[model samples]
Target: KELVLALYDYQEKSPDEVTMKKGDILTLLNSTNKDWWKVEVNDRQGFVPAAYVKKLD
Candidate 1:
């Protein structure tokens, strides 16, 4: 139920990881940990560092 913006490019570590670019919009899918979060972008899903994204209104 949250929208976030990518602050920089993120390299994927696996097939499940979704590559992201600066200024990309993503949908927050999970927030199980304070340091990492699950997000969806361009129909791809992956985990990203919480510090790398900012919440969007």
Candidate 2:
């Protein structure tokens, strides 16, 4: 399983179709996604942003 941590707050809208907060440690299932990670937790894509999200150990 992949785990990532939010280094900064991110919200984009429609694209913010997803949202992440600073220090939001989430299970970023996919290893990669266009620099951003698409959330599959709900069969939808959002809560997305690898730019502000750091790959956690």
Best candidate, lDDT-wise? 1
lDDT tens per residue, model 1, 1-57: 699999999988876677889999999998788988899998888888888889897
Give the alpha carbon lDDT tens digit for every residue of 1-57 in model 2. 667777887775775346666766667766456776765333445656557777767
RMSD (Å) of each candidate, 1 decimal: 1.3, 3.2
Against the hidden reference, what TM-scores do the models get? 0.86, 0.65
Candidate 1: RMSD over Cα atoms? 1.3
Lowest-lDDT window of 10 residues in candidate 2?
38-47
Clashes of each: 0, 4
